[PDB]
Design a protein around this nucleic acid. Structure first.
Lengths: 96, 108, 94, 82, 200, 94, 108, 81, 96, 200, 200, 200
DNA sequence: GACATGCCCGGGCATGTTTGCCTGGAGACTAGGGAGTAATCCCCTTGGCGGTTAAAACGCGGGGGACAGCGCGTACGTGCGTTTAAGCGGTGCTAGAGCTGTCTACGACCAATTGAGCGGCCTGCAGACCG
DNA sequence: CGGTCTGCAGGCCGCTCAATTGGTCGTAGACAGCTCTAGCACCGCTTAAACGCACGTACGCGCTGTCCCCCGCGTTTTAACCGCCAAGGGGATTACTCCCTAGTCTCCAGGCAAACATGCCCGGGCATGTC
């Protein structure tokens, strides 16, 4: 038999997902999350499909950029694993 | 009256001077707009448009496509640090990202 | 149906100057329309303030030129200024 | 959260996102921290978009409502109009 | 307080040709009394001698008397009684002949009388008329004004007219004249100022 | 001097209604003037865009009210909205 | 021809309504300005103004000074969470900083 | 003029870092700090001069600096605004 | 003899410089630096006195904020001494 | 009239550290009250609000009172009772609490008491002391001065000192301060004049 | 005190051509009496000899008398009785003929009379007239003035007129003249000064 | 009239260290009162305020009084009682406290007493003594001199000494001081004149 | 004759009211924007069934993360010595700020021509008929 | 099977509607020149705080070792998403009509600052007394 070590396919995944363009999150779960949030401000609101798609792309872009900074922070600590505090540091530096 | 001619044709531009003139007169940008103003602006927009499309065409060719798609815009823009700076806060629909891996992560 | 406008024709014309054999998808064309509109808003907004601070009422090629230099990186600015300069110069002669 | 709507953002999905950001290795605590951050981002954008929709007195949120809401937070989105 | 009426200020020379005259004093800064024909106005200091001449074409009968009374020149103040202010009313400066509150006194004359009018509330001072000496042409009375025009609670900076009436033994009107009065610290300076303003 | 209309008078009166004994330094007053101009420009700018987005010519209390919510944090926003409501409500009623 | 009432007085405000009416109507913020608009905005500015001054007055009293100074404005703005958003990126002349010392730096 | 970048002395750099809570400083910080400061200062100057040139003046005023700062997300209070 | 233990002076300096509000850069040197930069774009440029002060306060504010973020980055690596890497990391996270 | 005695003007901070304070008003044309620390002197318009602050290092006992009395600054006039002039004494401007003749009034306080001292003939106004309100370092009393310094028959251009005394429920002295007062039409012009003459 | 009336001063030569003359004395420092025609004024010392010449065109009847009386020249003072001041009135300088309070005396004449008029309160001195001596066209009377013009409480620096009347046995008027009088110290200095100022 | 005796003028500080002081007034022409240490001499106008300071090393008992009296400085005249001249004695200027004939008055003080000494015929004015406030070194009395030094029949240009004596409640002598006095219209001009003549 | 002593006029300061300039509000008239109603129909929401990847779960093993220890250097602290910044002052001129005058420019309107879309007509491709 | 003609789909020509262009007219914003003044620029001298450099000692940073748990990858199982389809109505959009608001223009009152008018005190000259 043949198999890889913990921490191998993860690197091939980096190459693959950096290369593609499609969404990495699922469609229906996201729609519900949007509406479940939106109803807090006002009930019965309707949405254009394009509106949801816009939200998805903005969210993915935001998170992916955040992960880049998070990754740099872990490298600065000379780790390889990312930690919640790595995220917190990057956000705080960015004024959030 | 005389045999007329288009303002864009006089300037040698492809972009429509008349539309720009209307736009500048609205948006509440100013009370008044000068004659050369839309002419100068149209040339600038046309120039920057050409730069993006040229780099995007090269990017499309490297992927063996004969048609520009949003992904090729994304790569082309990032490969020119000047445009990367100008658009440093723009999100591109279906743009993807750059294939960058940090050296410390590669195996040894 | 009611009437609408976009830059799609001009974007398509420009592409054939840089790559005569290359088409453009409508998704990409959408990006380009957003790009044109964004740059337009920036230049018009900044030129407005230049006139405002100098208490002028009229936007001229100078306010646009100055706004361009404040907005664009230096290399792009130099070329943009050259093209705008020629366009106005030729338009004046035409 | 209703029927676990936030959990609808699954563990593998979170993995895939971090991969684009070059993340090689992930601690298990990351998933909940990510979900909190994501919700804040959505809450702020949705709230502003709804505010635009209410001002127009429409009842359907359109793409332009989203595009404006994003813009003023310092982030401009191309392709969805605007 | 306020009077029920305003005395007539209309000039009336009457059967005897009654007119007033005044001395040709200069405009030295603080001259004690000086008169302006251009303004028909007397400028004088408080309690100082103010010579007023009486001119007639023929001599009035014996028992004729001369009265002086003050009114405010501005129409909106004409109904107020011209009197001394509460300060100069309380001061102990009575000459043994004049009441404390009267604005106008006559000096020198032992036969002077002072009237507070029961009906109008107006103050006035009266003396017998005397004819000129054989080679003179007019009779001089010496008035004193016992408050400044500026006296608060009194004249309060408001200009006044002095009205002079020639009267019979029973107070019947034989003639009437008037002049504006200013009682001030520097009558010469003030007269020159008001005469210079006549060219502005 | 030929200079712009400051807000110093009203700033001073507002302080007196809050801390009647206290005074203001020249630099503190200058800061408050910059502050008023900043907030003014933001609200007026956003209200402008609201009208533009909605193709309508006139700024009303609503455009301001919406802009106030977009600009201010929610706590400040509601208090500001209450005051703006009352001022207009009274002014039209009186 | 009745005797006038100043517009700020009519609203109960301290800020001068007529000024705002001119200002909104220039700088090309809009083509038209409605009569209630300046009134609404004047009240908003007045409210926010009061909050800053109130906090700064407390900050002055803490230092036992009779006069508000730039430092007192800084303290007010940073201690109040909402102002620290609205004015988050503002730089204030002679503002100084909060006495923030990280626990890891303390002696032990 | 020349070399006035060194006029930003090592103690000056200490004091700035101290206000920022910095307790202990490595020697290379001095050189790195000067580079960063220069870029920030230069970019502001360049914008302010560009405004001055548009007004066709030969003198920079505080308002040019204010505008130059402002657009970079740097609203400045106290010098006019 | 007596000498203060290293760091005990630093903590008192931190308090003093946080507490005060005056400029930390000597004014004449800063003014020369401004001109030394500006000359590279245009000779003979005059400056208002106020303008120079406006520049200086912006610069000190910028550097001070930078150092605080730098400090957090070093703390995140569980050092106490700051290094050029910490500065670079903070700036990079803010996209500078 | 005259007085049998002269009040003491000596400064005395006492057990409670008593001192006066005044508002930091400027010297513009439209000023109604302003104070000069260089002269220790108040400049104010007639009948306008004149705030005087009371400062202490520790709080006096309950029933403590604060009294104000005016005296002439020049030693030969010190035995004359400072009072309103005959005009302002007769005018109808009393507030229902203050007698017509008193120069100094306190506005806004119902516990005010006005004294015409049977043994010294001196006028004075008294109020209870109160400690500062929460958030204040001092207690403010609002005085009014009811004649100009130039009023003839009254102060007659003579400068006055206002003496402020902190005193117990029996009237025994706890603390004393004083300040010079000028009551005039243009407090800012006059204050700047006297502060400029301080260099001459 | 004041008089009820004023004596007439009008020049009246009458049936006898009455007129006055005076000696041609110089203006030296040691001079006691000197007269100025330019001023119609006599300058003299206190209590010294003052020669006045009576001139006539024809001789008056026997029993004619000559009277001298003083009045103040300024018209407001004319009703005050000219008398000696309270000092000279008390001093012990009477000659046995003149009452202590009379300003004007005649020396060298035993037939002099001094009148204090019960109806006017005026003082006057009278002597018989005598026709001129051999070698003179005029009759000389020697008066003395018993107070200086400057005497406070007396003439008080006010100028006086001496009125000379020629009269019959009943006191009816035969003629009248007058001259201004200054009683001083240094008549020569004063006469020259007033005569020099006549060119200024 | 003449007194039977001459008051002692000898300086005597006594048990209480009694001394006199005077203000540092300048020599402006018409300064109301000014004092010369070089001459030990006061120069002052008639009826005007003359501040005299009383200095002591310790406080005299309650009931102590301060008396002022005047004598002629020249030994030939020391027996004459210094009094007002006959003019100022008759004039109606009494303040309701002082007799008509007294040269020296005290103004402002209600507890003043005036003595005409039955044995010596000397006039004097007396007031109770009062101590200064604890940080002031002297008590000021304000005298008035009611005749000029040049008043004829009165001082008659003869210089006077004012003698000030501190006394107990029975009139026994506790201390004594003196100063020369000139009463004149221009105290500043005259003081400079006499201080210049000190070099001649 | 020289000096000593008092009053009036002139000069300056002290003390209050009137006149001039700028700003804001109130009233009246004209055109567009905003508001309301009726109608059309496209898009969003909701529901169904089937197919299939993605997600969830559990196990085993290895690398990374973490904690502790030791060595040497880099930094901090303090002393003595040196330099320049800050302070205050002096001198010279360029440019900023404001005003006045005149022109060319831009806004506005009407008329004409071309472009884009729609309707009608023509050409090519696919189908039917003739040689 | 090859050649010619008809209908449908795509392209071209004409008309309609809209946008752009051209030309004419009107009113002002911008450009230009000028003037006055303020601030900036440049230089000097003095006083002292800050900066520079050197020396000594210690706390920190860096590298290494050792231990354990957490994360990765694999295989199996279950759940939910995705795809295509169908139906119903609400909301958005378009067109048409009516009323109110804001903008523009003209006129009146109030608010804020400067100048003048008038009273009070001291000095100079002249007038008058003394030696």
């Amino acid at each position: 038999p043949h198999r890889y070590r913990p921490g191998t396919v993860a690197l091939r995944e980096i190459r693959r997902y950096q290369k593609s363009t499609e969404l990495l999150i699922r469609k229906l779960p996201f729609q519900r999350l949007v509406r479940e949030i939106a109803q807090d401000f006002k009930t019965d609101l309707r949405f254009q499909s394009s509106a949801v798609m816009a939200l998805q792309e903005a969210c993915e872009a935001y998170l992916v950029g955040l992960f880049e900074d998070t990754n740099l922070c872990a490298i600065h600590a000379k780790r390889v694993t990312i930690m919640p505090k790595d995220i917190q540091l990057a956000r705080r530096i960015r004024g959030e | 009256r005389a045999k007329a001619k288009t303002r864009s044709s006089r300037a040698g531009l492809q972009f429509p001077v008349g539309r720009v003139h209307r736009l500048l007169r609205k948006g509440n940008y100013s009370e008044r707009v000068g004659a050369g103003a839309p002419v100068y602006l149209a040339a600038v927009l046309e120039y920057l448009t050409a730069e993006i499309l040229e780099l995007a065409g090269n990017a499309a060719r490297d992927n063996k496509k004969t048609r520009i798609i949003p992904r090729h815009l994304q790569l082309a823009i990032r490969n020119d640090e000047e445009l990367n700076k100008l658009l440093g806060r723009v999100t591109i629909a279906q743009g993807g990202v750059l294939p960058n891996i940090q050296a410390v992560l590669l195996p040894k | 149906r009611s009437r609408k406008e976009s830059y799609s024709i001009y974007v398509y014309k420009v592409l054939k100057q840089v790559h005569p054999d290359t088409g453009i998808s409508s998704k990409a064309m959408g990006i380009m329309n957003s790009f044109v509109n964004d740059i337009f808003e920036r230049i018009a907004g900044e030129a407005s303030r230049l006139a405002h601070y100098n208490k002028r009422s009229t936007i001229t090629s100078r306010e646009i030129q100055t706004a361009v230099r404040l907005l664009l990186p230096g290399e792009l600015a130099k070329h943009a200024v050259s093209e705008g300069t020629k366009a106005v110069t030729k338009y004046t002669s035409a | 959260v209703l029927r676990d709507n936030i959990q609808g953002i699954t563990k593998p999905a979170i993995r895939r996102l971090a991969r684009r950001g070059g993340v090689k290795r992930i601690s298990g605590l990351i998933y909940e921290e990510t979900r909190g951050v994501l919700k804040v981002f959505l809450e702020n954008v949705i709230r502003d978009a709804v505010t635009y929709t209410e001002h127009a007195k429409r009842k359907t949120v359109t793409a332009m409502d989203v595009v404006y809401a994003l813009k003023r937070q310092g982030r401009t989105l191309y392709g969805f109009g605007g | 307080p306020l009077s029920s009426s305003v005395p007539s200020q209309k000039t009336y020379q009457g059967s005897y040709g009654f007119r007033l005259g005044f001395l040709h004093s200069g405009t030295a800064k603080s001259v004690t009394c000086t008169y302006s024909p251009a303004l028909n106005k007397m400028f004088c200091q408080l309690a100082k001698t103010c010579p007023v001449q009486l001119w007639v074409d023929s001599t009035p009968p014996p028992g004729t008397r001369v009265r002086a009374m003050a009114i405010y020149k501005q129409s909106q103040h004409m109904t107020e009684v011209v009197r001394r202010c509460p300060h100069h009313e309380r001061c102990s400066d009575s000459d043994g002949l004049a009441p404390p509150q009267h604005l106008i006194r006559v000096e020198g004359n032992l036969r002077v009388e002072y009237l507070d009018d029961r009906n109008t509330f107006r103050h006035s001072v009266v003396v017998p008329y005397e004819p000129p000496e054989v080679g003179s042409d007019c009779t001089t009375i010496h008035y004193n004004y016992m408050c400044n025009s500026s006296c608060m609670g009194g004249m309060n900076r408001r200009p006044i007219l002095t009205i002079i009436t020639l009267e019979d033994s029973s107070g019947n009107l034989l003639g009437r004249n008037s002049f504006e009065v200013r009682v001030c610290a520097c009558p010469g300076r003030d007269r020159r100022t008001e005469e210079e303003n006549l060219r502005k």
